[PDB]
Amino acid sequence: MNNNMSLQDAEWYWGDISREEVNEKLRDTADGTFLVRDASTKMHGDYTLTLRKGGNNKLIKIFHRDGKYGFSDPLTFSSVVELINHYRNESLAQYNPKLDVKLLYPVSKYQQDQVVKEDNIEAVGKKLHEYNTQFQEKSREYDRLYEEYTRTSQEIQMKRTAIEAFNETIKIFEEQCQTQERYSKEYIEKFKREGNEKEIQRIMHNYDKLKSRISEIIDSRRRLEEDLKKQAAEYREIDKRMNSIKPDLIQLRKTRDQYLMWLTQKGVRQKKLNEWL
Amino acid sequence: GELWGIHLMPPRILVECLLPNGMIVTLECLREATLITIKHELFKEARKYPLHQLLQDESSYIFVSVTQEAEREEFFDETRRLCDLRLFQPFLKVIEPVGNREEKILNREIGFAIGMPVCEFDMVKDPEVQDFRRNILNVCKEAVDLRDLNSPHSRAMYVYPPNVESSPELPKHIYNKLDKGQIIVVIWVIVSPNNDKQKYTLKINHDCVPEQVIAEAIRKGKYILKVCGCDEYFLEKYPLSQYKYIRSCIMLGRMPNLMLMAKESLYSQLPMDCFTMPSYSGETSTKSLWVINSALRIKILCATYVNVNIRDIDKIYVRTGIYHGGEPLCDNVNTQRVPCSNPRWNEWLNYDIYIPDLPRAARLCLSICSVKGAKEEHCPLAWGNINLFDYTDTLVSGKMALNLWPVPHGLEDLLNPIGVTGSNPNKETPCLELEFDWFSSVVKFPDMSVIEEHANWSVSREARLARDNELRENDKEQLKAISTRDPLSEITEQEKDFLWSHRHYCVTIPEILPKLLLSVKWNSRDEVAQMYCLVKDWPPIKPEQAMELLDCNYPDPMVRGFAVRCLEKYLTDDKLSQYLIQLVQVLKYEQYLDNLLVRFLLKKALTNQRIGHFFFWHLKSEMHNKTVSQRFGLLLESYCRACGMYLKHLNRQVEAMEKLINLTDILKQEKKDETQKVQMKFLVEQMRRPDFMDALQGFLSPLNPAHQLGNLRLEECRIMSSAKRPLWLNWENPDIMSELLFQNNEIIFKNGDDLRQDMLTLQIIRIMENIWQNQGLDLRMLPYGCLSIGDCVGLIEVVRNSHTIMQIQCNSHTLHQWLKDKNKGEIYDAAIDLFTRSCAGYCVATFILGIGDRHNSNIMVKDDGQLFHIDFGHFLDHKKKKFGYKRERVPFVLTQDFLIVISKGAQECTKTREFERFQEMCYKAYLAIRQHANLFINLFSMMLGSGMPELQSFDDIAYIRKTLALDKTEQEALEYFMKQMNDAHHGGWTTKM
Ligand SMILES: Oc1cc(NCc2ccc(F)cc2)cc(-c2nc(N3CCOCC3)c3sccc3n2)c1
């Protein structure tokens, strides 16, 4: 029943898919997660067993010679199904002590068949068009939020420097008050005597004009801090909106990929796929 | 803008002048006025206000104010007008100057070049940054002593280096264009102040030395040959054909025009620059790493906040992992799942790895991830990476806070191990608190002598071993078969065990090193210690192969150190300039600021001004990016301090681009609803002004520093049709022999769009061309100049006499009719030959790279017949997503319009001799790039950390593997290529039948 099953009908056999297509399916998957594909037509060997171990993909070539399969000479297995199902029930420590792990979780080519239960091709072809439009809607929605996210991040950084630029200006304008307060005390005290109030009238007018400008510059820096808190809240708000769309973008992509993967089977014509997409 | 909130202040404005007596004098200014003009008007009016007697004369004081970047800049250069000061607000404080005046002017000029103040580096606490600044000056002084050794010839070699090819040998088809191996060359000589020109036509061998060319010219020590048009000299004693100008003239079929000029005249013109060293130039218990008998464990304390909507997200958690480059050294460990309201954990995460088995380049990669019939989507919120060992080989210990970065656009991976290490400088940011173990005060990684000691001990327990057993023929063939695999073709576990088993025999085939390194258990000090010894005395390999070992999958210091020493020995300044884009981006993968690669690049940048020019601009373009601002800024500070007189030339370029940024910002923001005509009036009015005329005239082109940009042809300058407002600019060539090469230099400035993708695509096209010319195929590509200089800011070279397809068409035969008129006479055959050869290279090049779909506006044709492409907006089929195709599309589909031109007006254009001859050129060209597939994969792998959406992961680079068909046989790859052209052409592309 198990070992008498054909290699085509086996769930873990994927045929002539690329190593990239294997990397996609085994990305962020548990240990012992595996599948089988055809070997590279450049290289020796018939099939390639890719399995997870320590968060890494482990490529193991399955060779053939005179009705027997295996990883190295001597080739002891009757078929590839016998080789896999053996290491589904037993560790690969037998072959190599390095990778002590079993073939626990087969990545099925009937995985999409579980999700897309609808049999008809035209019905599934219509849902692909619907799922793709929902995906493209949220994709354009995400791009518009990211355009704001960058523009907001830039303007915050422009403001953040301008706050420090205001503070240096205020230090210089307060140093100017120290420059006045230092050299004015000696000259005003010499001129408070001798009855020359005309001198103090001009100096104290100039001192008030300096303090008037300090009040305005401190107000401008105070007003900028409100725009910073306002625009920083927008950055946080936009980042919340994007992080809500992020998981929807993954699921809408992954679901649509499975609907596309289902129509890759049963030889659906490329012309029909592009019209739906 | 030149003032905060504004762009330019219209002349009539008030400025608050702050005097040292205490007074605050308001003053009416103009926008044009200089400092000594304003200081005359200030101290004129100063006598009215009180406390005048204690004020000194104007000459003793100097103006001071706050700049746009919050720096207290002192304006020593008083000729600088008010709008060029870059003030924050209109105020000016006068004081008596102090300190080293020569240092303060240099520091502001370096600060203007970098795009941030030098004082910001002084306020950095991190000792790695201050050690870099001090220690990198060793390279700077070593660089200037190299170029001042054989003075003043070596002085001239720095400023005007010989722009030459790598190999002096010509290809056969290049040599056959010459008359019996001789080129006809003209040497011009200026007569006098009267400015009349007289030519001396020569006929000499292609392999002559510039000295021998001067010896022949005197018939028709003292003199040197300059290229007419450019500021490019043939100083070094290379063969004449080896220079790029002369090599181009042979292919183009033009007369090479040289200028006889005195060696004493150029040597006197050189600066004789200076390099001043700047002003910044209980006992610990040290335990060894391999003594610690403990597994690695890291406590995640808490995360301060994260921008999550409590309603939409189910849970959040902290994903972590120990990584050696891209490869995880052990299983990735997660924290417990907690609510979004209170991010707090406090748990020791146990990693299955022994602390001694941690390799030297081991890194803690981590992120905060959100979670959403028992199904759930995981998404990264923020990410951050920490080097487990610091720059002084010390293991991290105790508490530390890591401010996490925003996730890049398109990255769906939970961790980002490819990205930069270190905390985010922005602290208003998600901050993950974590705690490492504390065993002693300092835990060090062992020395090389200790590693050799363990390496000999390791192999002793395993069962002179290189020559003990004999290497069989079956094994010797397998080592060659494994080396032929491309970088991303993953080696199998049988091959890993085989490569390691025969690690001592692998030295005989030294190009297998990257395969051998992937076979090493990097989570095992036994195997790493043994590899370290092999790497130490490994045979050196060709530079193009060594560039593989500088990507993100080879983070080990010894492996990288080997790779850099291969470049020091065998990388020519031609090929360094060729691959400079990728080598600069590789610095992002480096763990530490100080490394062997940055010292190599900085030395070559300071001993070659052509390399130093682009080295500055490739770094300066990414200074906005806070992931690399500090690294690239510190590196630019090293260059700008030591590059000498070229800093003054770079500031004129930097100031020119910033003014072009200011105007285009106004057009995009303020003049958004105005018509293009009214915008042109505004543009011309602002460009007419004297501050713009001084800045945008008399400076070197950033696309090529040999090109001098003279006066603006301001009437012929235009704004382009795009929404981003590109400027079609036009400069005079101020060189005295301009008409022989080119009179006007046209550059398209651009502020809205990203040109890194076109810059890369055009670099690859240049390399693709260079492979074909060396191999024998004369396929003339046109990799026009394109340089990115900022955040979506770049320049594009204008090709003269170039027209789009839609211009010629607006009937299938119209394109062939136009080309026949422009090349009427007996030169028709050369035009069709050039068109057909150009079509072939671009048909193959676009298919491999997978550029955006070619329409009639994207395709362009020249008068001579050379077809070429423009606007490589995206590549590697980046729009495979946003859609669901696994198919490899054909961008440049040759329609009836193009096939008629190849076939020379035949009805059955697809069934002629010319089309079959055209087909064979594409096949030879396709297989030529397939044989050099490693080079391109390596070049793309070095760009993964750049930040381009098109190159984020190895999944994106794998498109060129599918189009080149590297997993398949050479013959299967050719049959694949034939089928892809057939599907796109709907049967028109004839099968091998
Ligand atoms: O490397 C590139 C990228 C992009 N894309 C951006 C763009 C989009 C719309 C637009 F109108 C102008 C530029 C455009 C060009 C590009 N180059 C041009 N060239 C002029 C001839 O010499 C080569 C460069 C022209 S002539 C009319 C348009 C145009 N666009 C080159």
Q: Which of A96, A115, A134 is where one domain is finished?
A: A115
Instruction: Say which residues have a Cβ less than 8 Å from residue B612's Cβ, sequence separation at least 6.
Output: B605, B606, B639, B643, B646
Cβ pair B379:A217 closer than 8 A = no
User: Quick check: B6 contacting A, CB < 8 Å?
Assistant: no
Joined tokens for residue B236:
């070094």
Find the B871 Cα to ligand 1 centroid distance in Å. 6
Closest CA to B64 of B52, B51, B75: B75
Inter-chain CB proximity B490 and A18 less than 8 Å: no
**Angle at alpha carbon of residue B654, lines to B651 and B658, rounded to 5°:** 135
Is A243 at the interface with chain B, CB within 8 A?
Answer: yes
**Cα nearest neighbour of B50 on chain A:** A203
Count CB atoms within 10 A of the CB of residue B955.
13
C-alpha to C-alpha distance for B756 and A38, rounded to whole angstroms = 37
For residue A89, the domain's CATH number is 3.30.505.10
Asked if residue A236 is part of any domain, the answer here is: yes
Considering the domain boundaries, does residue A2 fall inside one?
A: no
Q: Confirm or reject contact between A173 and chain B (CB < 8 A).
A: yes
Domain boundary among A65, A86, A115: A115
What one-character DSSP code corresponds to residue A142? H
Nearest CA in chain A to B67: A165
Give kind and range of the element (H or E) at residue B399: strand B398-403
Per CB-CB distance under 8 Å, the chain B contacts of A153 are 406
Hey, how many other C-beta atoms are within 10 angstroms of the C-beta on B493?
21
CB contact under 8 A, A44 and B481: yes
Q: Are residues A57 and A133 in the same domain?
A: no
Extract the tokens encoding B904.
């020379």
B96 reaches A (C-beta below 8 A): no
CATH class of B448-650: mainly alpha
What CATH fold (topology level) applies to the domain B286-444?
Immunoglobulin-like (2.60.40)
Provide the residue range defining the domain that includes A255: 121-276
Structure-token pair, residue B586: 């590789």
Which single residue is written with the structure tokens 């363990």? B454
Q: Which position has the token pair 């907690």?
A: B338
Cβ distance of B493 and A162 shorter than 8 Å? no
Specify the 3-state DSSP secondary structure of B898.
helix
In order, the DSSP letters of B779-829 are -------EEEEETTEEEEEPPTTEEEHHHHH--TTHHHHHHHHHT-STTHH
Q: Of B21, B72, B966, which has the smallest distance from its Cβ to A168's Cβ?
A: B72
CB-nearest to A136 from B485, B494, B882 is B882
Contact (Cβ atoms closer than 8 angstroms) between residue B63 and residue B76: no
Residue A157: inside a domain: yes
What's the total number of domains in chain A? 2
CA–CA–CA angle B149, B578, B961 (5° rounding): 150
State whether A142 and A250 are in the same domain. yes
Taking the C-alpha atoms of residue A183 and residue A189, their distance in angstroms, rounded to an integer, is: 11
Nearest protein Cα to ligand 1, atom 23? B798
Enumerate the residues of chain B whose CB falls inside 8 A of the CB of residue A54.
328, 330-331
Window 56-85 of B: residues touching A by CB (8 A cutoff) are: 64, 66-72
B623, B979 contact by CB (below 8 A):
no
Rounded Cα distance between B496 and B522, Å, is: 13
Mutation for testing the A interface, residue in B7, B21, B23, B669 having most A CBs under 10 Å: B23
Q: Report whether B88 contacts B66 (CB < 8 A).
A: yes
A198 touches chain B (CB under 8 A): no
Between CA B227 and CA B236 the distance in angstroms is 14
- Record: contact A19-B967, CB cut-off 8 A: yes
Using the beta-carbon criterion (under 8 Å), do A139 and B882 form an inter-chain contact? yes
CB contact B955 to A (< 8 Å): yes
A265 and A183 in a single domain? The answer is yes
Interface of A with B in 112-131 (CB under 8 A): 128
A54 and A176: one domain?
no
Same domain, residue pair A176 and A252: yes
Q: Which of B725, B796, B807, B862 to mutate to test ligand 1, by most ligand atoms within 8 A of the CB atom?
A: B796
DSSP-assigned beta bridge partners for residue B315: B371
Measured from CB, residues less than 6 Å from any atom of ligand 1 are B 720-722, 726, 753, 758, 784, 786, 796, 798-799, 802, 870-871
Minimal CA separation from B897 to chain A, in Å: 25
Chain B residues in contact with A180 by the CB 8 A cut-off are: 22-23
Q: Which residues of A touch B52 (CB under 8 A)?
A: none
Q: Do A68 and A130 reside in the same domain of the chain? A: no
* Same domain for A99 and A213: no
Looking at the fold, whether A125 and A104 belong to one and the same domain comes out as no
Q: Which atom of ligand 1 is nearest to the CA of B721?
A: 11
Residue B799 near residue B782, CB atoms below 8 Å: yes
Q: Which of A80, A95, A115 is the last residue of a domain?
A: A115
Nearest CA distance, B312 vs chain A (angstrom) = 6
User: CA B881, CA B494: separation in Å to the nearest integer?
Assistant: 35
Subunit contact A202:B49, Cβ cutoff 8 A: yes
Report the Cα B742 to chain-centroid distance in Å.
28
The answer to the question of residue A1 being in a domain is no
Distance in angstroms (rounded) separating the CA atoms of residues B921 and B872 = 23
- A60 and A170, same domain (yes or no): no
Is some CB atom of chain B closer than 8 A to the CB atom of A197?
no
Q: Which CATH number goes with the domain that contains A162?
A: 1.10.287.1490
Could you give the CA distance from residue B192 to residue B257 in angstroms, rounded to a whole number? 19
Question: Cα(B505)–Cα(B516) distance, rounded to whole angstroms?
Answer: 11
If asked whether residues A77 and A146 sit together in one domain, one would say no
Query: Closest approach of chain A CAs to the CA of B330, in angstroms?
Result: 5
> DSSP H helical segments within B571-628, as ranges?
573-578, 580-586, 596-607, 609-620
Ligand 1 pocket test target in B748, B750, B755, B764 with most atoms within 8 Å of CB? B748
DSSP conformation letters of A51-77: EESSSSEEEEEEEESSS-EESSSSP-B
Question: Nearest 5 degrees, angle CA B872-CA B877-CA B878?
Answer: 85
Q: Is residue A6 part of a domain?
A: no
A172 and A269 in a common domain: yes
Residue B230 near residue B706, CB atoms below 8 Å: yes
A221 interfacial to chain B (CB closer than 8 Å): no
Atom of ligand 1 lying closest to residue B720 CA = 11
Residues whose CB is less than 8 angstroms from the CB of residue B886 and which lie 6 or more positions away in sequence, other chains included: A21, A264, B880
Relative orientation angle of helices B896-903 and B913-931, to the nearest 10 degrees: 100
Q: Minimal CA–CA distance to A160: which of A214, A66, A112, A229?
A: A229
Do residues A108 and A126 both lie within one domain? no
CB-based contact B777:B928 (threshold 8 Å) = yes
Q: Which method resolved this structure?
A: X-ray
Residue to probe by mutation, ligand 1, list B789, B859, B866, B871, most atoms within 8 Å of CB: B871
Cα angle B844-B845-B849, degrees, rounded to a multiple of 5? 120
Q: Do the domain assignments include residue A13?
A: no
